[PDB]
Design a protein around this ligand. Structure first.
Ligand SMILES: CCCCCCCCCCCCCCCCCC(=O)OC[C@H](COP(=O)([O-])OCC(O)COP(=O)([O-])OC[C@@H](COC(=O)CCCCCCCCCCCCCCCCC)OC(=O)CCCCCCCCCCCCCCCCC)OC(=O)CCCCCCCCCCCCCCCCC
Ligand SMILES: CCCCC/C=C/C/C=C/C/C=C\C/C=C\CCCC(=O)O[C@H](COC(=O)CCCCCCCCCCCCCCCCC)COP(=O)(O)O[C@@H]1[C@H](O)[C@H](O)[C@@H](O)[C@H](O)[C@H]1O
Ligand SMILES: CCCCCCCCCCCCCCCCCC(=O)OC[C@H](COP(=O)(O)OCCN)OC(=O)CCCCCCCCCCCCCCCCC
Ligand SMILES: CCCCCCCCCCCCCCCCCC(=O)OC[C@H](COP(=O)(O)OCCN)OC(=O)CCCCCCCCCCCCCCCCC
Ligand SMILES: CCCCCCCCCCCCCCCCCC(=O)OC[C@H](COP(=O)(O)OCCN)OC(=O)CCCCCCCCCCCCCCCCC
Ligand SMILES: CCCCCCCCCCCCCCCCCC(=O)OC[C@H](COP(=O)(O)OCCN)OC(=O)CCCCCCCCCCCCCCCCC
Ligand SMILES: CCCCCCCCCCCCCCCCCC(=O)OC[C@H](COP(=O)(O)OCCN)OC(=O)CCCCCCCCCCCCCCCCC
Ligand SMILES: NC(=O)C1=CN([C@@H]2O[C@H](COP(=O)(O)OP(=O)(O)OC[C@H]3O[C@@H](n4cnc5c(N)ncnc54)[C@H](OP(=O)(O)O)[C@@H]3O)[C@@H](O)[C@H]2O)C=CC1
Ligand SMILES: CCCCCCCCCCCC(=O)OC[C@H](COP(=O)(O)OCC[N+](C)(C)C)OC(=O)CCCCCCCCCCC
Ligand SMILES: CCCCCCCCCCCC(=O)OC[C@H](COP(=O)(O)OCC[N+](C)(C)C)OC(=O)CCCCCCCCCCC
Ligand code: SF4
Lengths: 123, 71, 340, 184, 128, 177, 89, 350
């Protein structure tokens, strides 16, 4: 038959927000635990704490989503991303998409006020 | 032995009272650690001792005392 | 000293250039079997092709991968080539016409031959890849397995001769080539020689493996040249074993009558002519065997590892043990044990 | 010539000492196996020098061609842990190593003598300051070499030993299968 | 200093000379991406040694006894006339004993790698 | 310290207009000729056979054109290859793989872009998943047009690369330094 | 007989004071046997006596079988543990 | 959307009266409107500078000697962005062709050894003089000339002496040029630095490995150069680009060893013996440690008290210790619970 792969979870839409909260915290634990494996697979310059910080920021972004269906989709996609990272299916190039700040300073001029944005036609 | 756990859980943010770590202190009640923060501290503990902890037991942990009781 | 140096230079040049032109011959012969031409452009009639490949490779950068024992990866192909070429020191092109006239020449052939598995064995260890280790393990298993077959046939032949001197073994075939009473052994020896050189259809390691091109996948530059040269040199040398064990070496036909017509006394002219006839006989036998290697490459698909291990240990080896029984029995029945 | 060619035996001895030390001190056990192969080539050199080139070829055929190949095969397939030579681990052995070296070497040279006095026993060991005189005679008309004579005695005078060796080889087949294969 | 020894010295010299020419003439520009092991263009994770089949071990281990068996016949073929009929009988007995071991190896299927997964042949039965 | 002045010439001809005159010039010309002859005659490409262009590449090795008559042999391993031929659409998912294979080639090395997809994106230029020309990923020596280029067009491109090889200064370039 | 004696003694000391890996123990066994055979073959030459060479041949065959069995034992030991410790025995 | 992080504004006026309007958002298909010539662009620093320039679509003219060596540069820009010219310092016309259309000329041409065709004076004084004359004749808006740290006219080193001479001749010819002195530069595949320390057979010092400098990341030098390129308030200023914290050579070797997990071999030799060796080795055709580099081994970095620094470019150099593991990764050498866990797995099968 056609069997599932490493760290594959069948898609199940949780009927309750608490039963989803359990699964979500388990996924967060999985990510935090895989951080050192990630740093080894993807030959990263930065530290393991930086990876774990990034993971926290990712999970933080959806801290206030209310609709159960949306949380279900966010969870299923987050698990897909975990499976992609832990199996080394990603290359370094796509993994480093998650760490834009880790790259060096892009230049002297990142405008913040109106006048600087207006001088670069970005007002 | 427990002093190692206190050292692991002392070096974390969001807590302004390092001396508030009493052997029976609850993370969500005393430290004001988030659910995510609780997962982080549990992972830090199990990494410091090198031991893997299963899902049910990890989730049921809620305080320093339970951490030592399992340690 | 001077004569020794001249003779060694002549023999070495002939062997190295024969190896160089065998690669061109394989390309051309495969091509015409496949209704194409093959190299006809680098040099006249494509006669400089091998030298172009050699110069190109000699100017190519050597890469040492990061997890690699660089010394072992640069010396393994070197030792395989060195043993492969050392094997030529005992091949005679006429009675006693050899670089090394050893009473233990057959034993020398077998011992230097048994030094031939270390390239495959060490090449996989050269890196730190498990793909590489498994592939090297399989190739080594195939090599020693068919080494048993070749050694058995050697011993079966020595049963007729009772000598380890290669010239003597050739000389006893003036009555009949040993391929005539032992024709199935000719077939088996050729099959095993193809397997022992890891040639198609016995080319698991290079063409169905985890690494794209065998355990030479990581080799560039002169190490690659060493492996390639060692392979073709072993093709010709194992064919020379076939020739002197079963094909009568440098023997063609009795030219006593023709020589007595042509010449009236010994001269350098008669000596040169006899040397040419002997060497041409051995050379034409080598040519037929090289052509057969290429022809078998042209005709067949590959075995798997399991298939070839089964072929060696369940089909060929039991037959060879039965032959171990039947040959001395025939010598006993007819009172034909060979003297020393 | 003469200077080098006279001390070929002594060079083989010195190389053997060095090769053994390198076997024991190798970081990677595969490198240790390679130095073992080197020691066997040196032993073949010595055997050729004393007139036993047939045993040189046999040693190359069997100990390098078969036994060393099996060694490498096994270390490739298997997960081996090894520690490196270090003072922390091995300087504690130096006193016992020195006493054992002296005692074992001296006794291994003395077991060959027939003199009652112990010092004479040891002294005879270093007592070959003389050349052997090689002489000819004409009583051997056959072309009998070492291999032929071995075959002659092994198959007739000592045939029983050959058949018992056949049993030993049978063991070398049946035993490995018994403990490396899981039946049914 | 006959041709044998000179030839044997000469071969490694030529190998080393070709190696030296390649070192002297080719460029040498290592860098991290070039230094990676080539595995189809991707990167794989470092793994514990693969679990292997017992037949892999058994071919190499059984090579040694069979090789010794074969090589023990060298004294016989070098002495066949001298030992003629007595030694012929002895060598037959020796061969038969070794063939019994070959029989054991063949009947135990010792070098066969069995494909662990096999098609299911159970009938489909319904409890009506 | 000591040297305080220069005698450098002012109209020294450029490498594309310089011609041998001094028999050291002639020696270096002969050496470069030998090296370039070997590079042309032993032309070993690694195939990045992505798509339909690869079919035409297969036909270059088929009996009608018989690439190996010129000394061309295709190699599985980049370690044994001098030429990369990008023959097919390069997708974003594939771009790091192509860069990785290119980086593992030992030097000297050259790249042939074959077909519109590899050249600039071709029929899929406006796709969300397609690299718009393989020269965003690797340096390219020769571009072969067509969708696909015919076998003869690909052979023509190989001849252009061989012309570039034949005109390379190697020891003459070092002599200029 | 010097080369054989030195090889045997040094191989024995390497076996005894081995604290590094188990392969060194296997190698030291093989090389002790080699040293014994060298001593024997020199005496065989000096006596012009075939008995020493016969025993040396038998020693070679037995060393082969002993190697095969020792490595089978090592593999059977590996099968349960998956690794060999630097005290692996 | 991308941005023009190098540009302060969208409309720009060069000192030569050319109006440049930047088009697009700042990515590969955008153009800044600037044209730059980078002498020595195929080298270690030049390739980074060319990458940064071509990234935002400023037209880059690259004069080159050997064709195969510049090919990688083409990848850094869109179609028409990187343009190659054949150039040689003894062909004045080729220098003129190289600088003729540019708004910016930066010269990175230097060599750490002498050749049969170019001694230190020919490459650092005469070549700098000729490039500067072409610049001044064509009235180029911006000229950035790169020298080394410790460039001083009466120096014991011929390198430093000819570099100081080149600075003086440049200032004499083009009075509005910007002179940049970098400290030793480390980075991916650097020259006579980290990469040498990670794969040398033996590092041989004639001064115990006591010389000090402030090593600087090459990326930071290129970023500083781009900032100097685009702000016209750096006209006629001197820049000393050096790293944050001072190091000894022995210290750097120690860090390399610790990150490598491999011990680097150091030998100390007498200066006479080692200078003789380097002079002898100059006979081969490939680059090799110079007698003048042995001379410089006795000179420690000396920062000008009055020179603009990274601070004036609003830039903060990275730290060598934090970068070394990344920079040297390809050359890295490589129980109780493991045994118990191993027991549960299968190791041999049918
Ligand atoms: C033919 C003869 C051999 C040719 C070798 C040519 C050569 O040396 O190339 C070096 C060259 C150096 O490599 P590299 O990339 O420059 O690495 C050096 C560091 O990057 C940084 O380089 P470095 O600064 O550390 O320098 C290393 C230095 C070595 O320098 C030292 O360490 C010596 C320091 C002591 C100096 C004072 C000594 C006393 C002097 C007395 C005064 C005179 O080597 C050299 O300087 C160049 C070689 C010297 C040639 C000069 C000839 C001039 C006259 C013509 O080698 C290569 O190009 C690598 C090729 C890959 C080799 C693969 C195979 C290697 C394994 C072979 C094992 C063979 C075993 C056989 C048994
Ligand atoms: C008739 C010819 C015989 C037929 C076939 C044999 C081969 C003939 C071809 C002969 C010469 C062409 C090949 C020459 C060639 O590519 O080296 C070019 C330079 O180029 C010359 O200027 C360096 C000078 C080249 C010296 C030529 C010597 C010719 C005879 C060789 C024996 C590239 O090396 P390169 O600059 O990176 O310099 C070196 C060199 O590769 C390594 O030895 C160094 O260790 C390494 O540091 C590296 O930097
Ligand atoms: C040495 C390594 C192992 C030796 C391999 C033995 C190969 C061999 O069989 O040598 C035999 C050969 C002389 O034997 P033979 O056939 O009797 O010559 C009579 C010719 N009418 O021998 C020869 O022809 C030449 C001698 C080859 C071996 C010399 C090696 C010198 C060993 C000393 C090393 C010094 C350290
Ligand atoms: C695959 C490769 C197979 C090619 C084998 C070709 C065999 C033909 C040559 C046989 C050579 C031989 O061993 O005996 C030849 C010998 C020649 O006789 P002559 O030159 O007059 O010298 C007399 C002194 N005996 O004495 C003879 O002439 C005997 C007759 C020749 C041997 C029998 C030939 C008939 C069977 C040939 C089958 C070959 C395999 C197919
Ligand atoms: C001297 C002892 C033996 C006496 C004579 C030799 C007897 C014949 C030898 C037969 C050749 C096959 C066996 C050779 C032994 C293998 C040597 C060896 O062990 O090489 C591997 C080893 C790698 O160890 P590695 O990790 O690099 O050590 C670094 C320490 N900082 O590398 C090393 O340990 C050191 C580097 C070894 C370089 C070997 C170069 C010679 C290669 C063989 C050439 C054979 C002759 C040709 C006329
Ligand atoms: C017959 C021809 C023999 C030619 C052999 C000459 C070797 C010269 C090449 C060389 O200089 O050493 C290269 C060797 C490469 O190893 P390494 O650079 O340390 O690590 C790279 C891992 N990516 O670097 C080394 O570690 C040196 C290993 C061998 C030591 C020899 C020292 C040579 C010194 C040159 C003077
Ligand atoms: C077959 C032909 C083989 C002969 C090739 C002819 C070579 C012609 C070279 C002309 C000599 C001009 C010269 O002075 O070359 C010296 C050269 C060093 O010159 P340079 O570029 O300044 O190197 C500085 C880097 N240390 O150093 C060298 O040229 C080293 C080249 C030695 C080649 C020896 C080959 C014999
Ligand atoms: N790396 C460091 O630590 C330091 C470097 N510098 C200076 O930085 C500048 C570039 O640095 P870096 O990249 O490391 O050096 P590189 O050697 O890598 O590049 C130097 C450039 O100058 C060219 N060059 C040298 N001589 C000539 C010549 N006669 N004619 C034409 N071009 C020539 C080279 O061209 P080609 O490739 O054709 O030879 C090369 O492109 C140099 O001026 C250097 O002196 C100073 C302080 C620190
Ligand atoms: C045995 C050797 C026989 C082969 C020699 C004839 C080839 C030839 O001489 O060919 C001519 C060669 C160049 O060959 P080409 O450039 O490929 O021209 C072939 C024209 N095509 C492309 C139409 C086919 O001229 C030479 O420099 C010869 C010097 C080579 C000396 C090395 C010989 C090695 C021995
Ligand atoms: C012992 C000898 C064999 C071993 C030596 C190593 C092999 C050397 C091969 C040299 C043959 C060769 O190089 O051919 C000669 C080459 C031909 O160049 P081309 O025709 O312009 O290239 C055309 C490529 N096309 C066909 C694609 C367009 O250069 C020369 O004419 C210069 C003269 C070289 C003389 C060298 C003589 C060597 C003796
Ligand atoms: S260029 Fe045309 S033929 Fe070639 S891969 Fe693209 S679509 Fe297919």
């Amino acid at each position: 038959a056609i069997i599932a792969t490493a760290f594959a979870e069948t898609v199940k839409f949780s009927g309750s927000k608490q039963e989803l909260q359990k699964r979500t915290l388990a996924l967060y634990r999985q990510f935090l635990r895989g951080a050192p494996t990630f740093a080894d697979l993807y030959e990263v310059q930065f530290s393991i704490p930086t990876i774990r910080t990034k993971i926290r920021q990712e999970f933080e972004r959806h801290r206030f989503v209310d609709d159960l269906s949306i949380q279900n989709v966010l969870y299923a996609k987050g698990h897909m991303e975990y499976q992609e990272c832990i199996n080394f299916w990603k290359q370094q190039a796509q993994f480093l998409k998650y760490f834009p700040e880790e790259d060096d300073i892009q230049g002297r001029h990142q405008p913040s006020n109106f006048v600087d944005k207006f001088l670069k036609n970005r007002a | 032995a427990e002093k190692r756990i206190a050292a692991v859980l002392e070096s974390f943010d969001k807590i302004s009272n390092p001396a508030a770590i009493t052997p029976t202190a609850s993370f969500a009640k005393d430290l004001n650690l988030d659910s995510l923060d609780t997962v982080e501290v549990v992972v830090a503990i199990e990494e410091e001792f090198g031991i893997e902890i299963p899902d049910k037991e990890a989730d049921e942990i809620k305080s320093v005392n339970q951490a030592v009781e399992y340690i | 000293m001077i004569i020794n140096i001249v003779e060694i230079l002549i023999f070495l040049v002939c062997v190295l250039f024969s190896v160089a032109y065998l690669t061109v011959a394989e390309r051309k012969t495969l091509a015409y079997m496949q209704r194409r031409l093959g190299p006809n452009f680098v040099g006249y009639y494509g006669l400089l092709q091998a030298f172009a490949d050699a110069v190109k490779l000699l100017l190519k950068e050597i890469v040492l991968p990061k997890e690699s024992n660089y010394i072992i990866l640069v010396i393994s192909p070197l030792i395989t080539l060195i043993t492969a070429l050392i094997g030529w020191v005992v091949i005679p092109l006429g009675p006693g016409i050899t670089l090394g006239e050893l009473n233990l020449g057959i034993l020398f052939s077998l011992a230097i031959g048994s030094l031939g598995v270390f390239g495959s064995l060490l090449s996989g260890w050269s890196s730190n890849s498990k793909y590489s280790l498994l592939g090297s393990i399989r190739s080594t298993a195939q090599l020693i397995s068919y080494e048993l077959i070749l050694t058995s046939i050697f011993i079966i032949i020595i049963m007729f001769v009772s000598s380890l001197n290669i010239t003597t073994i050739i000389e006893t075939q003036r009555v009949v080539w040993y391929c005539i009473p032992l024709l199935p052994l000719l077939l088996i020896f050729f099959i095993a020689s193809v397997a022992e050189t890891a040639r198609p259809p016995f080319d698991l390691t290079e063409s169905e493996s985890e690494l794209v091109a065998g355990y030479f996948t990581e080799y560039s530059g002169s190490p690659f040249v060493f492996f390639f040269l060692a392979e073709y040199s072993n093709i010709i040398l194992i064919s020379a074993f076939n020739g002197y064990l079963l094909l009568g070496g440098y023997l063609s036909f009795n030219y006593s009558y023709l020589f007595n017509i042509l010449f009236n006394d010994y001269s350098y002219v008669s000596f040169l002519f006899e040397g040419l006839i002997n060497s041409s006989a051995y050379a034409i036998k080598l040519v037929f065997l090289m052509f057969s290697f290429i022809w078998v490459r042209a005709a067949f698909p590959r075995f798997t590892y399991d298939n070839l291990i089964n072929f060696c240990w369940i089909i060929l080896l039991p037959l060879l043990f039965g032959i171990f029984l039947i040959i001395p029995s025939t010598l006993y029945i007819f009172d034909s044990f060979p003297t020393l | 010539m003469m200077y080098l060619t006279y001390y070929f035996i002594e060079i083989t001895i010195f190389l053997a000492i060095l090769c053994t030390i390198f076997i024991i001190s190798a970081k990677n056990p595969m490198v240790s196996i390679l130095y073992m192969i080197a020691l066997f080539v040196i032993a073949a050199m010595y055997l050729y020098l004393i007139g036993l080139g047939i045993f040189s070829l046999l040693y190359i055929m069997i100990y390098i061609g078969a036994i060393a190949v099996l060694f490498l095969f096994i270390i490739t397939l298997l997960d081996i842990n090894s520690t490196e030579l270090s003072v922390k681990s091995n300087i504690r052995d130096l006193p016992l190593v020195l006493i054992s070296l002296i005692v074992l070497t001296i006794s291994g040279l003395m077991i060959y003598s027939n003199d009652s006095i112990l010092i004479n026993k040891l002294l005879e060991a270093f007592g070959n300051d003389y050349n052997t005189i090689i002489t000819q005679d004409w009583f051997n008309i056959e072309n009998t070499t070492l291999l032929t004579t071995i075959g002659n005695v092994l198959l007739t005078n000592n045939a029983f030993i050959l058949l018992v060796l056949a049993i030993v080889l049978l063991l070398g087949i049946i035993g490995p299968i018994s403990i490396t294969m899981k039946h049914k | 200093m006959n041709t044998f020894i000179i030839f044997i010295i000469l071969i490694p010299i030529v190998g080393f000379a070709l190696l030296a020419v390649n070192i002297l003439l080719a460029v040498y520009k290592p860098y991290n991406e070039k230094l990676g092991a080539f595995e189809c263009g991707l990167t794989s994770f470092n793994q514990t040694r693969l679990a292997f089949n017992a037949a892999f071990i058994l071919v190499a281990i059984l090579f040694l006894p069979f090789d010794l068996e074969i090589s023990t016949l060298l004294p016989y073929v070098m002495s066949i006339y001298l030992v003629s009929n007595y030694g012929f009988t002895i060598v037959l007995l020796f061969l038969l004993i070794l063939i019994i071991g070959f029989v054991y190896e063949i009947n135990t299927n010792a070098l066969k790698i069995n494909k662990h997964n096999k098609p299911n042949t159970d009938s489909l039965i319904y409890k009506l | 310290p000591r040297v305080s002045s220069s005698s450098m010439p002012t109209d020294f001809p450029l490498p594309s207009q310089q011609k041998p005159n001094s028999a050291v010039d002639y020696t270096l010309t002969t050496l470069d000729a030998v090296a370039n002859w070997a590079r042309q005659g032993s032309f070993w490409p690694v195939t990045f056979g992505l798509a339909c262009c690869a079919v035409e590449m297969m036909h270059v090795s088929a009996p009608r054109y018989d690439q190996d008559r010129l000394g061309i042999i295709f190699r599985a391993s980049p370690r044994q290859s001098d030429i990369m031929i990008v023959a097919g659409t390069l997708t974003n998912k594939m771009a790091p793989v192509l860069r990785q294979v290119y980086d593992q080639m030992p030097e000297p090395r050259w790249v042939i872009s074959m077909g519109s997809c590899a050249n600039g994106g071709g029929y899929y230029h406006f796709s969300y998943s397609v690299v718009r020309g393989c020269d965003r990923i690797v340096p390219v020596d020769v571009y072969v047009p067509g969708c696909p280029p015919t076998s003869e067009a690909l052979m023509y491109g190989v001849f252009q690369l061989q012309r570039k090889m034949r005109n390379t200064k190697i020891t003459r370039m070092w002599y200029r330094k | 007989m010097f080369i054989g004696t030195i090889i045997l003694v040094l191989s024995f000391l390497g076996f005894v004071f081995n604290r590094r890996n188990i392969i060194l123990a296997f190698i030291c066994l093989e090389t002790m046997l080699l040293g014994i055979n060298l001593i024997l073959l020199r005496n065989s030459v000096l006596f012009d006596d075939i008995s020493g060479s016969l025993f040396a041949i038998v020693i070679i065959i037995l060393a082969g079988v002993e190697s095969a069995i020792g490595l089978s034992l090592l593999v059977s030991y590996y099968r349960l543990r998956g690794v060999i410790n630097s005290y692996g025995i | 959307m991308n941005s023009f992080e190098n540009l302060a504004q969208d409309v720009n006026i060069t000192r030569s009266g050319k109006t440049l309007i930047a088009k697009g958002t700042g990515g590969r298909s955008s153009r800044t409107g600037y044209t730059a010539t980078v002498f020595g662009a195929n080298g270690f620093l030049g390739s980074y500078l060319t990458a940064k320039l071509a990234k935002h679509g400023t037209t880059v003219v690259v004069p080159y000697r050997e064709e195969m060596a510049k090919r990688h540069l083409k990848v850094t820009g869109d179609l028409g962005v990187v343009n190659f010219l054949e150039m040689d310092l003894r062909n004045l016309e080729s220098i003129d062709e190289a600088v003729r259309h540019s708004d910016i000329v930066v010269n990175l041409i230097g060599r750490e050894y002498e050749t049969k065709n170019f001694n230190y004076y020919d490459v650092h004084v005469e070549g700098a003089r000729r490039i500067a004359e072409a610049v001044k004749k064509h009235n180029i808006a911006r000229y950035i000339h790169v020298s080394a740290f410790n460039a001083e006219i009466d120096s014991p080193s011929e390198f430093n002496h000819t570099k100081g001479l080149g600075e003086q001749v440049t200032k004499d010819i083009v009075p509005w040029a910007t002179i940049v002195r970098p400290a030793p530069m480390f980075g991916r595949e650097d020259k006579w630095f980290l990469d040498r320390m990670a794969r040398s057979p033996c590092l041989v010092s004639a001064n115990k490995f006591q010389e000090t400098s402030n090593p600087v990341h090459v990326i930071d030098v290129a970023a500083a150069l781009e900032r100097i390129c685009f702000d016209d308030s750096t006209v006629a200023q001197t820049f000393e680009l050096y790293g944050p914290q001072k190091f000894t050579q022995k210290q750097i070797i120690d860090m390399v060893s610790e990150t490598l997990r491999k011990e680097v071999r150091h030998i100390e030799l007498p200066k006479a013996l080692y200078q003789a060796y380097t002079k002898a080795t100059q006979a081969i055709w490939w680059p090799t440690y110079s007698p003048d580099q042995v001379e410089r081994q006795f000179l420690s970095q000396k920062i000008d008290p009055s020179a603009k620094t990274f601070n004036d470019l609003d830039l903060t150099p990275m730290e060598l210790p934090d970068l070394m593991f990344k920079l040297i990764r390809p050359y890295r050498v490589n129980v109780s619970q493991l045994e118990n866990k191993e027991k549960t797995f299968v190791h041999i099968l049918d």
